[PDB]
Amino acid sequence: MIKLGIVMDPIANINIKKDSSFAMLLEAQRRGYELHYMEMGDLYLINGEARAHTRTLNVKQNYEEWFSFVGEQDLPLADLDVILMRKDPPFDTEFIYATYILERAEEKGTLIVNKPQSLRDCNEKLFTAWFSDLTPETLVTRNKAQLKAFWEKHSDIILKPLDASIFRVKEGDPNLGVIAETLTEHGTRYCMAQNYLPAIKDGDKRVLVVDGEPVPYCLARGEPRPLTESDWKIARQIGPTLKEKGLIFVGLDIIGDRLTEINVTSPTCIREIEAEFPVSITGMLMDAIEARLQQQ
Amino acid sequence: MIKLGIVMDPIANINIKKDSSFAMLLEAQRRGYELHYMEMGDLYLINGEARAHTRTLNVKQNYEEWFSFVGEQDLPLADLDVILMRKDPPFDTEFIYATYILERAEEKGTLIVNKPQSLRDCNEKLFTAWFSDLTPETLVTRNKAQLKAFWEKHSDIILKPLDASIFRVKEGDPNLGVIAETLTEHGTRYCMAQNYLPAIKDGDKRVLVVDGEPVPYCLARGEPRPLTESDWKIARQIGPTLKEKGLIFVGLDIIGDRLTEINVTSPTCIREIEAEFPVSITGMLMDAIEARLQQQ
Amino acid sequence: MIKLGIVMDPIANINIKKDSSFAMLLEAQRRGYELHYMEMGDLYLINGEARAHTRTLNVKQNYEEWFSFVGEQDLPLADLDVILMRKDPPFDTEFIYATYILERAEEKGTLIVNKPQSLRDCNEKLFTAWFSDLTPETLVTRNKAQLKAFWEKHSDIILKPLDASIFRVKEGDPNLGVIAETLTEHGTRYCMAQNYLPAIKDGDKRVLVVDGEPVPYCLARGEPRPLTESDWKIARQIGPTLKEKGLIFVGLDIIGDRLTEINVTSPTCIREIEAEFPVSITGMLMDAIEARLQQQ
Amino acid sequence: MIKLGIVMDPIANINIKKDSSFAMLLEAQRRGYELHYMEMGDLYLINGEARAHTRTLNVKQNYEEWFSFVGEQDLPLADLDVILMRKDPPFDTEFIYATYILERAEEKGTLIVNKPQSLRDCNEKLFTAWFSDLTPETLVTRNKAQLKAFWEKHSDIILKPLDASIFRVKEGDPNLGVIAETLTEHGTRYCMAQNYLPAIKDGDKRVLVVDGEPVPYCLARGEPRPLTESDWKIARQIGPTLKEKGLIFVGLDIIGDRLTEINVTSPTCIREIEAEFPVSITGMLMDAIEARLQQQ
């Protein structure tokens, strides 16, 4: 059958009425896939070969006991058909090292959702630089004088770190300097400034794109809604790029008609959209994995 | 003429009788290129466009004054023909962010030595996993029991961090556990174990590869020597891979006949090999840049 | 009655068959004291006055439910008769700040076990510098050459950080330099070197001293034993110093006949000695608190 | 004669037209004291004895060469008559460890300006809790809800870290939450809130107190002024406390008539007040050291 492995944060600490990874494993199990559970420290490389200690997993929607380990084994990752990298942020050097281990399994045949090269290529915040007609005014910089200047042109801006801690600097704010000194760690780290978008008050929308195809309903942060006309427009412009880069399950953050962020590591909000609308997002996902597998 | 920019650590603090970047700028200047000096904080991105504050640079082999700024300007990086990313390690998230800015200039036409995607793809220590027949026995892992076990099979090993702090664990060593707990930061970070290679006592050799072509003389750490037969063998096996990945100037670390490391960010030792042998490594480099430029 | 407060790490995560703080609260409760539970973040200072959010606590030896909160209140800490600072290490700047808040309650009348000034005065490892006839050869330093030299005089030594990660450097060890560079963080932090004491193989003993009086039975790390003649000697030399500094409950680490460490923040091993011998260490402690209270 | 040692940051990097430590050594030299220069890493403890590697120092007001080492020696610190701890902040655990080494010399007879116990006892920001009638409304806390509440009572406040990065939170500010989450590092570190004092626009004054005696002229941050009537009042209330705690050279920060901070580690502004007024602050200091020495 299909052997599906998943790399995620400790399953003993998730919340099963909210967790999207849990919802994914329930579906994989319903289709009869064999599940192999892994945490970051279970992955290792012995002379170029990617291996891991997996536990064969059984999951059930039960708040006292939602998982059971039914086997334990040390296998080559190239013995799995597909691996869901569902590790949470930050995207740090430890995450970059795990991406090289997954890439060695990938060369030997395993499908990796999402593709390790593209996880390294597509930072959630700096990747929007490749879709500049879809985003707000964005400055990435290490210095105060440029941030101050961006603030004079736009009057009301958003400063965030790259590495949610967002500061709003609007007219008359006494704090531009200390905020920029704290976020750049005194001119030694890049930070991002964008102009403030007042339509955030209508909802910061989370849109999902399953292998280039927008899921028809999104969640505005919480209210599920159909995609508006502008959500369709944005999502279909990025979608072919995400499909060809092997970004099979993607979350887009849209405030009003502007694209603000692209979650490529662990996009969530599956449970809240499936509860209101007649869509099986996890079904869409496993259908996309099954197509990718009987292809290459 | 050719407009060459360079991103490096403060030029006011290098040692000009040793610095390879300095040797590169002297050569570029001798061929009449216009030089543009940049530090990390000079790079920024305004709505997808890569820009920087550069200073037009003049360099001379003079220990009281080896550089002069002769102009200052804010330009788009796509106005440079080529940029030498010569920033020193560590390879951290700040270095990964700079690689995305350089990649936006690269899309608009600038040659980047070395290619930003490949700097992210090719970690100095984990990239040797792709040339496993050329390297020592290597385990990358987060746990103690696997390291202890690697130590039972090999008896005398080398433990290093991924992120030089190398520990040697030979028979009868009382410290395996604390070393692995310190280097893995208590099982939370990957570390590397390799078997100890006694031929390090003959020299840890630094070999240079200019766009897939080995420089005929290397430096064994310090004694310049011609490449042995085994150095030729190793360097010519990796060289086509480095050429196609846009890794135009590479340093390989070879102890005996084993490849231990691949420096892809700021390879040095130019000055020590040019002082003994009749080779102009910087000439080889600028010749390779000139070919790449009158090509694509 | 006596109102006893305790500052400790989350009571929901301790192990009640091992925790010494738990054993203390059971005793305080048996004597009918009112218990007030606090974590670090519950402590605050409003214009010089020390206050905290406490929960009135009920504890029971029950592995499903060992505590219950039976009230919640914001009070001045000067309304407590005594506070057990039982916060675990490290001893960092956050711990030093909490010590100033406890000291403001102390000035207004509360007994603080142990005294905040003395927690700042008596570092577990550097305080043994005041009992140099009782300790091994000890060097505290930032440099390699002094450590190397200490190693030439003693041949087999122990290197530890100040801030258990102990390294043993015995004859023929290849790692002196990297260990000293890692532990001093390249000459920027003090570390400690002591000569290795081979009698650690007989047990690293944990001796308890309740307001200057040694508890007659200690635990050798695990085997409970009576104090030997040399344990009596060591403990009675330090004990008057600990009583006058307000160090009411102290743990001493003794390997052979040498004093290696003085735990002044959260000394444990109560449960393991009470289980074998007919001593109530917590009874000794509450008896000492009751004396101190009907005194000053 | 008097043997004076000084522990300070690298003398090769100070600015001699501004540095107060430099001004102190020029004076000590004019009175014919022998000077012994030390950095932090020169201090060490061998079996309870405080020692250091000193260099015998010669200083001169010359911008090409303001110091010369005229001898080198390893001595016990108890061979110095007095040591100026003039190390810059932060006040961290490394600084606390150095304070224990200086205290071992102090027990053997050396005068330490300022007294090591009192450096540990008197944090620059939390020590103002002992002079609450002289300070603004001050809350030290780890939580958001208390900070928000302090902000409702006062409407315009100052938030600073304990560990200058001050934020001003006045009416209509959108950032209270992220500022408190950044400064408390998500509820894990204490921060300080004080009400904003609008008279800072008249000058944040730096007042100096030499062994309990206010220097008659202060610097308002830069304009030298005589002490006002309220500066005299504040400084003479704290001064007997500073004298008895062995805080011989102290800087007080006064905005309007409120005491905001007490610099106990490395108070400066000597050069700017001596340049305008006929006061020799360093003379006052050496006079105070000379009295302390021919006393105890």
Side-chain angles (χ1 to χ4, degrees), chain C residues 215-278:
Chain C
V215 176
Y217 304 96
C218 74
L219 184 99
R221 306 273 193 192
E223 184 184 323
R225 303 158 177 188
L227 306 196
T228 58
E229 181 178 6
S230 27
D231 299 343
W232 282 115
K233 194 282 209 301
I234 294 177
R236 190 61 58 158
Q237 204 188 281
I238 313 153
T241 302
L242 306 178
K243 182 218 271 296
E244 74 164 290
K245 283 196 146 295
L247 295 173
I248 297 176
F249 185 57
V250 187
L252 308 180
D253 268 86
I254 291 173
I255 290 170
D257 53 359
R258 314 319 292 144
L259 178 74
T260 67
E261 216 153 303
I262 301 173
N263 191 326
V264 148
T265 65
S266 202
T268 190
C269 297
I270 287 180
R271 290 292 185 137
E272 299 80 6
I273 299 165
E274 287 186 346
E276 299 286 329
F277 291 112

Side-chain angles (χ1 to χ4, degrees), chain C:
Chain C
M1 66 303 260
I2 290 173
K3 301 182 193 76
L4 173 296
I6 186 164
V7 187
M8 61 155 105
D9 286 88
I11 196 171
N13 300 120
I14 46 76
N15 195 330
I16 58 159
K17 43 198 166 64
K18 242 167 295 295
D19 199 89
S20 290
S21 301
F22 198 66
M24 291 183 198
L25 299 168
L26 285 173
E27 182 54 25
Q29 188 174 267
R30 192 192 69 86
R31 299 192 178 210
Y33 296 4
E34 178 172 77
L35 309 176
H36 284 263
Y37 177 76
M38 296 159 281
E39 293 179 24
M40 286 282 252
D42 290 312
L43 301 179
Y44 71 94
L45 207 70
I46 174 71
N47 303 313
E49 184 187 47
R51 304 198 140 233
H53 161 260
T54 69
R55 277 180 297 247
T56 313
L57 180 84
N58 171 84
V59 292
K60 65 214 174 95
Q61 199 65 18
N62 179 127
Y63 296 84
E64 324 282 82
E65 208 213 318
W66 54 91
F67 72 99
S68 301
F69 291 133
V70 296
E72 186 152 355
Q73 52 274 132
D74 177 85
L75 46 66
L77 289 193
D79 280 1
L80 299 185
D81 298 319
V82 54
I83 302 167
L84 301 170
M85 179 51 157
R86 288 288 305 174
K87 180 61 184 65
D88 284 325
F91 198 77
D92 57 1
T93 46
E94 281 311 297
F95 201 121
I96 285 149
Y97 295 136
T99 261
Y100 297 131
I101 294 171
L102 299 175
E103 195 175 4
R104 292 248 84 229
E106 183 189 46
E107 287 166 81
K108 279 187 194 163
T110 309
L111 183 83
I112 308 300
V113 179
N114 291 139
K115 182 172 181 75
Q117 187 177 46
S118 294
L119 293 172
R120 288 188 311 259
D121 292 343
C122 304
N123 177 271
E124 321 308 57
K125 301 188 191 195
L126 275 93
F127 196 32
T128 59
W130 283 257
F131 307 95
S132 13
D133 67 301
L134 297 175
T135 58
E137 295 268 305
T138 306
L139 168 61
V140 178
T141 191
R142 288 195 176 180
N143 33 276
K144 199 188 299 299
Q146 277 188 275
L147 292 177
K148 189 188 190 181
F150 187 79
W151 181 46
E152 294 178 327
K153 179 191 181 186
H154 293 280
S155 284
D156 186 0
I157 61 166
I158 287 312
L159 290 307
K160 53 178 72 176
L162 295 185
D163 308 80
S165 188
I166 76 95
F167 282 86
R168 183 164 159 206
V169 178
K170 59 192 209 156
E171 183 68 30
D173 217 281
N175 295 326
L176 185 275
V178 286
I179 292 164
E181 222 50 356
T182 298
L183 296 186
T184 65
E185 273 170 50
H186 299 256
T188 59
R189 299 183 86 76
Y190 299 106
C191 74
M192 182 164 97
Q194 290 174 318
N195 58 299
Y196 176 70
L197 307 181
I200 184 188
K201 276 56 207 164
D202 279 48
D204 181 351
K205 299 169 274 169
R206 288 282 188 75
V207 171
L208 296 188
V209 179
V210 180
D211 206 35
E213 298 305 310
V215 176
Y217 304 96
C218 74
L219 184 99
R221 306 273 193 192
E223 184 184 323
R225 303 158 177 188
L227 306 196
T228 58
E229 181 178 6
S230 27
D231 299 343
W232 282 115
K233 194 282 209 301
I234 294 177
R236 190 61 58 158
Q237 204 188 281
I238 313 153
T241 302
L242 306 178
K243 182 218 271 296
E244 74 164 290
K245 283 196 146 295
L247 295 173
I248 297 176
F249 185 57
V250 187
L252 308 180
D253 268 86
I254 291 173
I255 290 170
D257 53 359
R258 314 319 292 144
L259 178 74
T260 67
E261 216 153 303
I262 301 173
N263 191 326
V264 148
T265 65
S266 202
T268 190
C269 297
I270 287 180
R271 290 292 185 137
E272 299 80 6
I273 299 165
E274 287 186 346
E276 299 286 329
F277 291 112
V279 75
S280 187
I281 299 161
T282 58
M284 277 182 71
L285 217 201
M286 297 314 136
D287 285 337
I289 284 165
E290 286 182 16
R292 296 285 188 147
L293 291 170
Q294 331 295 124
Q295 186 180 88
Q296 309 308 146

Side-chain angles (χ1 to χ4, degrees), chain A residues 40-41 43-48 91-94 96-98 100-101 103-104 107 117 120-121 123 126 129-130 132 136-143 146 150 162-163 188-190, chain B residues 40-41 43-48 91-94 96-98 100-101 103-104 107 117 120-121 123 126 129-130 132 136-143 146 150 162-163 188-190:
Chain A
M40 286 282 252
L43 301 179
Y44 71 94
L45 207 70
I46 174 71
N47 303 313
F91 198 77
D92 57 1
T93 46
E94 281 311 297
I96 285 149
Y97 295 136
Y100 297 131
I101 294 171
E103 195 175 4
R104 292 248 84 229
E107 287 166 81
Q117 187 177 46
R120 288 188 311 259
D121 292 343
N123 177 271
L126 275 93
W130 283 257
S132 13
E137 295 268 305
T138 306
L139 168 61
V140 178
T141 191
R142 288 195 176 180
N143 33 276
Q146 277 188 275
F150 187 79
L162 295 185
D163 308 80
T188 59
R189 299 183 86 76
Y190 299 106
Chain B
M40 286 282 252
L43 301 179
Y44 71 94
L45 207 70
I46 174 71
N47 303 313
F91 198 77
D92 57 1
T93 46
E94 281 311 297
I96 285 149
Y97 295 136
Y100 297 131
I101 294 171
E103 195 175 4
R104 292 248 84 229
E107 287 166 81
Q117 187 177 46
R120 288 188 311 259
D121 292 343
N123 177 271
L126 275 93
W130 283 257
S132 13
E137 295 268 305
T138 306
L139 168 61
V140 178
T141 191
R142 288 195 176 180
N143 33 276
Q146 277 188 275
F150 187 79
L162 295 185
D163 308 80
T188 59
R189 299 183 86 76
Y190 299 106

Side-chain angles (χ1 to χ4, degrees), chain D residues 124-222:
Chain D
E124 321 308 57
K125 301 188 191 195
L126 275 93
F127 196 32
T128 59
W130 283 257
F131 307 95
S132 13
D133 67 301
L134 297 175
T135 58
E137 295 268 305
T138 306
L139 168 61
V140 178
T141 191
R142 288 195 176 180
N143 33 276
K144 199 188 299 299
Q146 277 188 275
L147 292 177
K148 189 188 190 181
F150 187 79
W151 181 46
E152 294 178 327
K153 179 191 181 186
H154 293 280
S155 284
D156 186 0
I157 61 166
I158 287 312
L159 290 307
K160 53 178 72 176
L162 295 185
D163 308 80
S165 188
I166 76 95
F167 282 86
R168 183 164 159 206
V169 178
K170 59 192 209 156
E171 183 68 30
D173 217 281
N175 295 326
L176 185 275
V178 286
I179 292 164
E181 222 50 356
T182 298
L183 296 186
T184 65
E185 273 170 50
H186 299 256
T188 59
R189 299 183 86 76
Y190 299 106
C191 74
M192 182 164 97
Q194 290 174 318
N195 58 299
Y196 176 70
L197 307 181
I200 184 188
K201 276 56 207 164
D202 279 48
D204 181 351
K205 299 169 274 169
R206 288 282 188 75
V207 171
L208 296 188
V209 179
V210 180
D211 206 35
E213 298 305 310
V215 176
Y217 304 96
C218 74
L219 184 99
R221 306 273 193 192

